[PDB]
Coordinates of C-alpha atoms and ligand atoms in Angstrom, one line a residue:
Chain A
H3 CA 46.3 -32.0 -19.6
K4 CA 47.8 -29.3 -17.3
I5 CA 47.1 -30.8 -13.9
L6 CA 47.8 -34.5 -14.6
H7 CA 51.3 -33.7 -15.9
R8 CA 52.5 -31.6 -13.0
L9 CA 51.6 -34.3 -10.4
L10 CA 53.3 -37.2 -12.2
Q11 CA 56.5 -35.1 -12.0
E12 CA 57.0 -33.4 -8.7
Chain B
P1 CA 46.5 -81.3 -16.9
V2 CA 43.5 -81.4 -14.6
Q3 CA 40.1 -83.2 -14.5
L4 CA 36.8 -82.2 -15.9
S5 CA 34.0 -83.8 -13.8
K6 CA 31.1 -85.7 -15.1
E7 CA 29.1 -82.5 -15.3
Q8 CA 31.7 -80.3 -16.9
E9 CA 31.9 -83.0 -19.6
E10 CA 28.3 -82.8 -20.6
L11 CA 28.3 -79.0 -20.4
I12 CA 30.8 -78.8 -23.2
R13 CA 28.9 -81.4 -25.1
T14 CA 25.7 -79.3 -25.3
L15 CA 27.5 -75.9 -26.0
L16 CA 28.8 -77.4 -29.2
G17 CA 25.6 -79.2 -29.9
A18 CA 23.9 -75.9 -30.4
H19 CA 27.0 -74.0 -31.6
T20 CA 27.9 -76.3 -34.5
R21 CA 24.2 -76.4 -35.4
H22 CA 23.9 -72.6 -35.6
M23 CA 27.1 -70.7 -35.4
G24 CA 30.7 -71.5 -36.4
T25 CA 29.8 -72.7 -39.9
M26 CA 27.5 -69.7 -40.5
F27 CA 30.4 -67.8 -41.9
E28 CA 30.2 -69.8 -45.2
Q29 CA 26.6 -68.4 -45.6
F30 CA 27.6 -64.8 -45.7
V31 CA 27.9 -65.1 -49.5
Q32 CA 24.2 -65.4 -50.0
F33 CA 23.5 -61.9 -48.7
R34 CA 24.2 -60.3 -52.1
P35 CA 27.9 -59.7 -51.3
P36 CA 29.5 -56.9 -53.3
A37 CA 32.0 -58.1 -55.9
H38 CA 35.2 -56.6 -54.4
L39 CA 34.7 -59.0 -51.4
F40 CA 35.3 -62.0 -53.6
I41 CA 38.1 -60.3 -55.5
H42 CA 40.1 -59.3 -52.4
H43 CA 42.9 -58.1 -54.6
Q44 CA 41.6 -54.5 -54.3
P45 CA 39.2 -52.3 -52.2
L46 CA 35.9 -50.7 -53.2
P47 CA 36.6 -48.3 -56.2
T48 CA 37.4 -44.8 -54.9
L49 CA 34.0 -43.5 -56.1
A50 CA 31.8 -46.6 -56.4
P51 CA 28.4 -46.5 -54.6
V52 CA 28.7 -47.6 -51.0
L53 CA 25.1 -48.7 -50.4
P54 CA 25.5 -52.1 -52.1
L55 CA 28.0 -53.0 -49.4
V56 CA 26.1 -51.5 -46.4
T57 CA 23.0 -53.4 -47.3
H58 CA 25.1 -56.5 -47.1
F59 CA 26.6 -55.4 -43.7
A60 CA 23.3 -54.8 -42.0
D61 CA 22.2 -58.1 -43.7
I62 CA 24.8 -60.4 -42.2
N63 CA 24.7 -58.5 -38.9
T64 CA 21.0 -58.9 -38.5
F65 CA 21.6 -62.5 -39.7
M66 CA 24.5 -63.2 -37.2
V67 CA 22.5 -62.0 -34.3
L68 CA 19.8 -64.3 -35.5
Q69 CA 22.1 -67.4 -35.2
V70 CA 23.3 -66.2 -31.8
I71 CA 19.6 -66.4 -30.8
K72 CA 19.0 -69.8 -32.5
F73 CA 22.0 -70.8 -30.4
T74 CA 20.6 -69.8 -27.0
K75 CA 17.3 -71.6 -27.6
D76 CA 19.2 -74.9 -27.9
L77 CA 20.0 -74.4 -24.2
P78 CA 18.0 -76.1 -21.4
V79 CA 19.3 -73.6 -18.9
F80 CA 18.8 -70.5 -21.1
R81 CA 15.3 -71.6 -22.1
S82 CA 14.9 -72.2 -18.3
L83 CA 15.3 -68.5 -17.6
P84 CA 12.3 -66.1 -17.6
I85 CA 11.9 -64.2 -20.8
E86 CA 12.5 -60.8 -19.2
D87 CA 16.0 -62.2 -18.5
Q88 CA 16.6 -64.1 -21.8
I89 CA 16.1 -60.7 -23.4
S90 CA 18.4 -58.8 -20.9
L91 CA 21.0 -61.5 -21.5
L92 CA 20.7 -61.2 -25.2
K93 CA 20.7 -57.4 -25.2
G94 CA 23.8 -57.6 -23.1
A95 CA 25.7 -60.5 -24.5
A96 CA 24.5 -60.9 -28.2
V97 CA 27.0 -58.4 -29.7
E98 CA 29.9 -59.5 -27.6
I99 CA 29.1 -63.1 -28.6
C100 CA 29.3 -62.4 -32.3
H101 CA 32.9 -61.0 -32.1
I102 CA 33.9 -64.0 -30.1
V103 CA 32.8 -66.4 -32.8
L104 CA 33.9 -64.0 -35.6
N105 CA 37.5 -64.1 -34.4
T106 CA 37.8 -67.7 -35.5
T107 CA 37.9 -66.5 -39.2
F108 CA 40.3 -63.7 -38.5
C109 CA 43.6 -64.1 -40.4
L110 CA 46.5 -63.1 -38.2
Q111 CA 48.8 -62.5 -41.3
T112 CA 46.5 -60.5 -43.5
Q113 CA 44.5 -59.0 -40.6
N114 CA 41.3 -59.8 -42.6
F115 CA 38.2 -61.9 -41.9
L116 CA 38.0 -64.8 -44.2
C117 CA 34.4 -65.9 -44.1
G118 CA 34.6 -68.7 -46.6
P119 CA 35.3 -67.0 -50.0
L120 CA 34.8 -63.4 -48.8
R121 CA 37.5 -61.5 -47.0
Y122 CA 36.5 -58.4 -45.1
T123 CA 39.1 -55.7 -44.3
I124 CA 39.4 -52.7 -42.1
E125 CA 38.6 -50.1 -44.8
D126 CA 35.4 -52.0 -45.6
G127 CA 34.0 -51.1 -42.1
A128 CA 35.4 -47.6 -42.6
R129 CA 33.5 -47.3 -45.9
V130 CA 30.4 -48.4 -44.1
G131 CA 30.9 -45.3 -41.9
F132 CA 32.3 -46.7 -38.6
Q133 CA 34.5 -44.0 -37.0
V134 CA 38.2 -44.8 -37.3
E135 CA 39.1 -45.4 -33.6
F136 CA 36.3 -47.8 -33.2
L137 CA 37.7 -49.9 -36.0
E138 CA 41.2 -49.5 -34.7
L139 CA 40.2 -50.6 -31.2
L140 CA 37.9 -53.3 -32.5
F141 CA 40.7 -54.7 -34.7
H142 CA 43.3 -54.8 -31.9
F143 CA 40.8 -56.9 -29.9
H144 CA 40.9 -59.7 -32.5
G145 CA 44.6 -59.5 -33.0
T146 CA 44.9 -60.0 -29.2
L147 CA 42.2 -62.7 -29.0
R148 CA 43.3 -64.8 -32.0
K149 CA 46.9 -64.8 -30.8
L150 CA 46.0 -66.7 -27.7
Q151 CA 45.1 -69.7 -29.9
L152 CA 42.0 -71.1 -28.3
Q153 CA 40.8 -74.6 -29.2
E154 CA 37.2 -74.7 -30.3
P155 CA 35.9 -75.7 -26.8
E156 CA 38.1 -73.0 -25.3
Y157 CA 36.1 -70.6 -27.6
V158 CA 32.6 -71.8 -26.9
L159 CA 32.9 -71.5 -23.1
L160 CA 34.0 -67.9 -23.4
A161 CA 30.9 -67.3 -25.4
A162 CA 28.8 -68.8 -22.6
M163 CA 30.6 -66.5 -20.1
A164 CA 29.8 -63.4 -22.0
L165 CA 26.2 -64.5 -22.1
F166 CA 25.6 -65.5 -18.5
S167 CA 26.5 -62.2 -16.9
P168 CA 24.3 -61.4 -13.9
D169 CA 25.3 -57.7 -13.8
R170 CA 23.4 -57.0 -17.1
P171 CA 20.6 -54.5 -16.6
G172 CA 17.2 -56.1 -16.5
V173 CA 18.2 -59.4 -15.0
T174 CA 15.7 -60.7 -12.4
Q175 CA 17.1 -64.0 -11.2
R176 CA 20.5 -62.6 -10.6
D177 CA 21.0 -65.4 -8.1
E178 CA 20.6 -68.2 -10.7
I179 CA 22.6 -66.2 -13.3
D180 CA 25.3 -65.3 -10.8
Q181 CA 25.8 -69.0 -10.1
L182 CA 25.6 -70.0 -13.8
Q183 CA 28.4 -67.4 -14.2
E184 CA 30.2 -68.8 -11.2
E185 CA 29.7 -72.2 -12.8
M186 CA 30.9 -71.4 -16.3
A187 CA 33.9 -69.5 -15.1
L188 CA 35.1 -72.6 -13.2
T189 CA 34.3 -75.2 -15.9
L190 CA 36.7 -73.2 -18.2
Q191 CA 39.4 -72.7 -15.6
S192 CA 39.7 -76.5 -15.5
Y193 CA 40.2 -76.8 -19.3
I194 CA 42.9 -74.1 -19.4
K195 CA 45.0 -76.0 -16.9
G196 CA 44.5 -79.2 -18.9
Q197 CA 46.6 -77.7 -21.7
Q198 CA 48.0 -80.7 -23.6
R199 CA 50.3 -78.6 -25.9
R200 CA 51.6 -75.5 -24.1
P201 CA 51.9 -73.3 -27.1
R202 CA 49.9 -70.6 -25.2
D203 CA 50.0 -68.5 -22.1
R204 CA 49.9 -69.5 -18.4
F205 CA 47.5 -66.7 -17.4
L206 CA 45.3 -67.4 -20.4
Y207 CA 42.1 -67.2 -18.3
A208 CA 43.3 -64.1 -16.5
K209 CA 43.9 -62.5 -19.9
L210 CA 40.5 -63.7 -21.2
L211 CA 38.7 -61.8 -18.5
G212 CA 40.5 -58.7 -19.5
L213 CA 38.9 -59.5 -22.9
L214 CA 35.4 -60.3 -21.5
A215 CA 35.9 -56.8 -20.0
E216 CA 37.1 -55.4 -23.3
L217 CA 34.1 -56.9 -25.0
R218 CA 31.9 -54.9 -22.6
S219 CA 33.7 -51.7 -23.8
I220 CA 33.0 -53.0 -27.3
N221 CA 29.3 -53.7 -26.8
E222 CA 28.8 -50.1 -25.6
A223 CA 31.0 -48.5 -28.3
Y224 CA 29.3 -50.3 -31.2
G225 CA 25.9 -49.2 -29.9
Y226 CA 26.9 -45.6 -30.2
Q227 CA 28.3 -46.2 -33.7
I228 CA 25.1 -47.6 -35.3
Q229 CA 23.1 -44.4 -34.4
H230 CA 25.8 -41.8 -35.0
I231 CA 25.6 -43.4 -38.5
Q232 CA 22.7 -42.0 -40.5
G233 CA 19.8 -44.4 -41.0
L234 CA 22.1 -47.5 -40.5
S235 CA 20.4 -48.3 -37.2
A236 CA 17.1 -48.5 -39.1
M237 CA 18.5 -51.1 -41.5
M238 CA 18.9 -53.8 -38.9
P239 CA 15.9 -53.5 -36.5
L240 CA 16.9 -56.6 -34.6
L241 CA 20.2 -55.1 -33.5
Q242 CA 18.4 -51.9 -32.7
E243 CA 16.6 -53.8 -29.9
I244 CA 19.7 -55.5 -28.8
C245 CA 21.3 -52.1 -28.4
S246 CA 18.2 -50.4 -26.9
Chain C
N1 CA 57.6 -63.8 -8.7
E2 CA 59.5 -61.8 -6.1
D3 CA 60.1 -58.8 -8.4
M4 CA 56.6 -57.5 -7.7
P5 CA 56.4 -57.2 -3.8
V6 CA 52.8 -57.5 -2.5
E7 CA 54.2 -55.6 0.5
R8 CA 54.9 -52.5 -1.7
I9 CA 51.3 -52.9 -3.0
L10 CA 49.6 -53.1 0.4
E11 CA 52.0 -50.4 1.6
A12 CA 50.8 -48.2 -1.3
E13 CA 47.2 -49.0 -0.4
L14 CA 47.9 -48.2 3.3
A15 CA 49.6 -45.0 2.3
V16 CA 46.6 -43.8 0.4
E17 CA 43.6 -44.2 2.8
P18 CA 43.0 -41.3 5.3
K19 CA 44.3 -41.4 8.9
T20 CA 41.0 -39.9 10.3
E21 CA 38.0 -42.0 9.4
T22 CA 35.0 -40.1 10.5
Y23 CA 31.6 -40.1 8.7
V24 CA 28.5 -38.0 8.5
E25 CA 25.2 -38.6 6.7
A26 CA 24.1 -36.9 3.5
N27 CA 20.7 -35.2 3.2
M28 CA 18.1 -36.6 0.7
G29 CA 19.6 -34.2 -1.9
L30 CA 16.6 -32.3 -3.3
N31 CA 18.7 -29.1 -3.7
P32 CA 22.1 -28.4 -5.2
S33 CA 22.7 -25.9 -2.4
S34 CA 22.8 -28.2 0.6
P35 CA 26.3 -29.1 2.1
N36 CA 25.2 -32.7 1.6
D37 CA 23.8 -32.8 -2.0
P38 CA 24.6 -36.4 -3.2
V39 CA 25.6 -35.9 -6.8
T40 CA 27.8 -32.9 -5.9
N41 CA 29.5 -34.7 -3.0
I42 CA 30.7 -37.6 -5.2
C43 CA 32.4 -35.1 -7.6
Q44 CA 34.0 -33.4 -4.6
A45 CA 35.2 -36.8 -3.5
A46 CA 36.4 -37.9 -6.9
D47 CA 38.4 -34.7 -7.4
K48 CA 40.1 -35.4 -4.1
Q49 CA 40.6 -39.1 -4.6
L50 CA 42.0 -38.3 -8.1
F51 CA 44.9 -36.4 -6.6
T52 CA 45.7 -39.3 -4.2
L53 CA 45.2 -41.7 -7.1
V54 CA 48.4 -40.3 -8.7
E55 CA 50.5 -41.0 -5.6
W56 CA 48.9 -44.4 -5.2
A57 CA 50.0 -45.1 -8.7
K58 CA 53.5 -43.9 -8.1
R59 CA 53.8 -46.1 -4.9
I60 CA 53.0 -49.1 -7.2
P61 CA 56.1 -51.3 -8.1
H62 CA 57.6 -50.1 -11.4
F63 CA 55.0 -47.4 -12.4
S64 CA 57.6 -44.6 -11.9
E65 CA 60.0 -46.5 -14.2
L66 CA 57.6 -46.1 -17.2
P67 CA 57.8 -43.3 -19.8
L68 CA 56.0 -40.1 -18.6
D69 CA 53.4 -40.4 -21.3
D70 CA 52.7 -44.1 -20.8
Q71 CA 52.0 -43.2 -17.1
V72 CA 49.4 -40.5 -18.1
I73 CA 47.9 -42.9 -20.7
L74 CA 47.4 -45.7 -18.1
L75 CA 46.0 -43.2 -15.7
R76 CA 43.9 -41.0 -18.1
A77 CA 42.2 -44.3 -19.1
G78 CA 41.9 -46.0 -15.8
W79 CA 41.3 -43.4 -13.0
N80 CA 37.6 -44.3 -13.3
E81 CA 37.7 -48.0 -12.5
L82 CA 40.4 -47.2 -10.1
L83 CA 38.5 -44.8 -7.8
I84 CA 35.4 -47.0 -8.2
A85 CA 36.8 -50.3 -6.8
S86 CA 38.6 -48.2 -4.1
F87 CA 35.3 -47.0 -2.6
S88 CA 33.5 -50.3 -3.4
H89 CA 36.0 -52.2 -1.1
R90 CA 36.0 -49.4 1.4
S91 CA 32.2 -49.5 1.7
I92 CA 32.1 -53.2 2.7
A93 CA 32.1 -52.0 6.4
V94 CA 28.4 -50.9 6.1
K95 CA 25.3 -52.3 4.5
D96 CA 23.2 -50.6 1.7
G97 CA 25.4 -47.6 1.9
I98 CA 28.5 -46.0 0.3
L99 CA 31.3 -44.5 2.3
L100 CA 32.9 -41.4 0.7
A101 CA 36.5 -40.2 0.7
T102 CA 35.1 -36.8 1.9
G103 CA 33.9 -38.7 5.0
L104 CA 30.3 -38.9 4.1
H105 CA 28.1 -42.0 4.1
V106 CA 25.6 -42.2 1.3
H107 CA 22.5 -44.3 1.9
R108 CA 20.8 -46.2 -0.9
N109 CA 17.7 -44.0 -0.3
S110 CA 19.5 -40.7 -0.9
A111 CA 20.5 -42.4 -4.2
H112 CA 17.2 -43.2 -5.7
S113 CA 15.9 -39.9 -4.3
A114 CA 18.6 -38.2 -6.3
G115 CA 17.8 -40.1 -9.5
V116 CA 21.0 -42.3 -9.6
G117 CA 19.6 -45.3 -7.8
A118 CA 20.0 -47.9 -10.6
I119 CA 23.8 -47.6 -10.8
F120 CA 24.2 -47.4 -7.0
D121 CA 22.4 -50.8 -6.7
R122 CA 24.6 -52.2 -9.4
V123 CA 27.7 -51.2 -7.5
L124 CA 26.3 -52.7 -4.3
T125 CA 25.3 -56.0 -5.9
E126 CA 28.3 -56.3 -8.2
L127 CA 31.3 -55.0 -6.4
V128 CA 30.7 -54.4 -2.7
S129 CA 28.3 -57.2 -2.0
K130 CA 30.6 -59.5 -4.1
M131 CA 33.8 -58.5 -2.2
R132 CA 32.2 -58.9 1.2
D133 CA 30.9 -62.4 0.3
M134 CA 34.6 -63.3 -0.4
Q135 CA 36.7 -61.4 2.2
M136 CA 39.0 -59.7 -0.2
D137 CA 41.8 -58.0 1.8
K138 CA 43.4 -54.6 1.0
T139 CA 46.4 -56.5 -0.6
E140 CA 44.1 -58.3 -3.0
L141 CA 42.4 -55.0 -3.7
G142 CA 45.8 -53.5 -4.4
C143 CA 46.6 -56.2 -6.9
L144 CA 43.4 -55.5 -8.7
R145 CA 43.7 -51.7 -8.6
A146 CA 47.1 -52.4 -10.1
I147 CA 46.1 -54.8 -12.9
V148 CA 43.6 -52.0 -14.0
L149 CA 46.6 -49.6 -14.0
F150 CA 48.4 -52.1 -16.3
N151 CA 46.0 -52.2 -19.2
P152 CA 48.4 -52.9 -22.1
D153 CA 45.6 -52.5 -24.6
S154 CA 45.5 -48.7 -24.1
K155 CA 45.2 -46.6 -27.3
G156 CA 48.5 -44.7 -28.0
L157 CA 50.7 -46.9 -25.8
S158 CA 54.3 -46.4 -26.8
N159 CA 55.1 -49.9 -25.6
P160 CA 52.1 -52.4 -25.3
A161 CA 54.5 -55.3 -24.7
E162 CA 56.2 -53.6 -21.8
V163 CA 53.0 -52.7 -20.0
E164 CA 51.7 -56.2 -20.6
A165 CA 55.0 -57.3 -18.9
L166 CA 54.1 -55.7 -15.6
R167 CA 50.5 -57.1 -15.6
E168 CA 51.8 -60.7 -16.0
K169 CA 54.2 -60.0 -13.0
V170 CA 51.2 -59.0 -10.8
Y171 CA 49.2 -62.0 -12.3
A172 CA 52.0 -64.0 -10.6
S173 CA 52.3 -62.2 -7.3
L174 CA 48.5 -62.3 -6.8
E175 CA 47.9 -66.0 -7.6
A176 CA 50.9 -66.5 -5.2
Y177 CA 49.4 -64.5 -2.3
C178 CA 46.1 -66.3 -2.9
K179 CA 47.1 -69.9 -3.1
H180 CA 49.5 -69.0 -0.3
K181 CA 47.4 -67.2 2.3
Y182 CA 44.1 -68.9 1.3
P183 CA 45.1 -72.6 0.7
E184 CA 41.7 -74.0 1.6
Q185 CA 40.2 -72.3 -1.5
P186 CA 42.5 -72.9 -4.5
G187 CA 40.5 -71.2 -7.2
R188 CA 40.4 -68.0 -5.1
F189 CA 42.9 -66.2 -7.4
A190 CA 40.3 -66.5 -10.2
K191 CA 37.2 -65.7 -8.0
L192 CA 38.9 -62.3 -7.6
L193 CA 39.2 -61.8 -11.3
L194 CA 35.6 -62.6 -12.0
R195 CA 34.7 -59.1 -10.8
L196 CA 36.7 -57.4 -13.6
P197 CA 34.2 -57.5 -16.5
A198 CA 31.7 -56.1 -14.0
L199 CA 34.0 -53.3 -12.9
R200 CA 34.3 -52.4 -16.6
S201 CA 30.7 -52.1 -17.4
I202 CA 30.2 -50.3 -14.1
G203 CA 33.0 -48.0 -15.0
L204 CA 31.4 -47.2 -18.4
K205 CA 27.9 -46.6 -17.0
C206 CA 29.5 -44.3 -14.3
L207 CA 31.1 -42.3 -17.1
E208 CA 27.9 -41.5 -18.8
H209 CA 26.5 -40.1 -15.5
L210 CA 29.6 -37.9 -15.2
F211 CA 29.2 -36.7 -18.7
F212 CA 25.5 -35.9 -18.1
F213 CA 26.1 -33.6 -15.1
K214 CA 28.7 -31.8 -17.1
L215 CA 26.7 -31.3 -20.3
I216 CA 23.4 -30.7 -18.4
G217 CA 23.5 -30.7 -14.7
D218 CA 24.1 -27.4 -12.9
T219 CA 26.3 -29.8 -10.8
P220 CA 29.6 -28.1 -10.1
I221 CA 32.5 -30.2 -11.4
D222 CA 36.1 -29.4 -10.4
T223 CA 39.6 -29.2 -11.9
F224 CA 41.4 -32.6 -11.7
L225 CA 38.1 -34.4 -12.3
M226 CA 37.1 -32.2 -15.2
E227 CA 40.3 -32.9 -17.1
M228 CA 39.9 -36.7 -16.8
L229 CA 36.7 -36.6 -18.8
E230 CA 36.9 -35.7 -22.5
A231 CA 35.1 -38.1 -24.9
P232 CA 32.1 -37.1 -27.1
Chain D
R2 CA 8.5 -52.8 -26.5
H3 CA 11.3 -55.2 -27.7
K4 CA 8.8 -56.5 -30.3
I5 CA 10.9 -58.8 -32.5
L6 CA 13.0 -60.3 -29.6
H7 CA 9.9 -61.2 -27.8
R8 CA 8.7 -62.6 -31.1
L9 CA 11.9 -64.5 -31.7
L10 CA 12.4 -66.1 -28.3
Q11 CA 8.9 -67.6 -28.5
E12 CA 9.5 -71.0 -30.0
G13 CA 11.4 -73.1 -32.5
Ligands
F15_301 C1 27.3 -44.8 -6.7 C2 27.0 -43.5 -7.5 C3 27.0 -43.8 -9.0 C4 26.6 -42.6 -9.8 C5 27.4 -41.2 -9.7 C6 28.6 -41.0 -10.7 C7 29.9 -41.9 -10.4 C8 31.3 -41.6 -11.0 C9 32.3 -41.1 -9.9 C10 33.6 -41.9 -9.7 C11 33.8 -42.3 -8.2 C12 34.5 -41.2 -7.3 C13 34.8 -42.0 -6.0 C14 35.5 -41.3 -4.7 C15 35.9 -42.2 -3.5 O1 36.8 -43.0 -3.5 O2 35.4 -42.0 -2.4

């Protein structure tokens, strides 16, 4: 799940 | 500890009238569907290499039979018999399955995590043997853990059944006005009983949680339907369900 | 229950919604090449509203506190019913139509004409209609969009008792704001919950559609949206 | 078309 992970972080 | 009007009183009196006459005690009848031996002798599962078919023919037998009682149940209803056929059908196709689980859970043993239907005791690998994908059974079993844990007095159980049933949003419904208000009606009749909790061994937001479950039961209705087709010929064995899931 | 501030909720809702609410009409969608093809527009709108869904989640009391994987779980299996109820509420300000996040109204006619009438009508009669005939404010919406977020029963949840903790807190705040703000109607808190089973079914049916345009449909699906759907 | 259900919901 590339996209989902990045968002929940930044 | 709230009231239950003169109407709400009779509502519960007729739900059980038809429930005790058709469901509830139907679990002690499962034994007459040529139940495999290992069910009686719960001290061990189906032999690693035994034939499965004897069991499956029992499964589809009590399933088709259960759905039959659910129907016998809805006919002992003035209001349901009062709905046009095209809707009774849409309400059965939409509720029927959900309604069975609801009743079923009353036999569920919290400790063992098994269904004790009289002398028989069904476990989670039985369903697995019958072919049901793992997750479905995992999901489906959590549901009952959750539901049984709430501890719902018999009446607290029947109402919920009614609520699953009288859902206006079901596809095919034609008098969505009547059903929408029958739904509005049931919902309320139960919210009253919940507050009138003599012993408070249960939750505060019981109702609020139960809806989560009526919602989960929807997920369930749909997931089961996919199961009995993804399973070779099984669908064919219980033509009644086949229509409930059509 | 002061721990879950309704003001953070409504503030999170208010943070989400656009600042420029303009709307155009979508053609009857008979060709996947028109700038207004119905099917295609909803997928363009769901990709978009999926991004903003993340932030709306964040801005919800305590969601950032949760483990990084329990966040993804609750989202992965919720984004659907989330985005749905969002636009359902949003579209109360028009009749027989659906207002998109891309700033595009979608008539009931362009629906049937594009094959997806049945589900459209179910949204209208089950969510939108229902909300309107009950004046549910953006704060009440928020509590519901939140309760969906807090589905303890998710599969793979590292802590199903912890997530069920949050949902009982909102259960409190919500029944509070209701019996508070709307005293005349007591059982208003529950009226609001009645729409949950419906949102589920509606959520499920909506999925199938989405799977269908992927599998079959030439219908161009995009990134964020694509990733959210992965079930045989 | 929904043969058995029709059948079933007929009468007692
Ligand atoms: C009403 C149309 C129903 C059939 C089409 C498929 C629906 C699934 C898409 C999820 C909804 C995205 C909504 C974006 C928004 O908030 O504007």
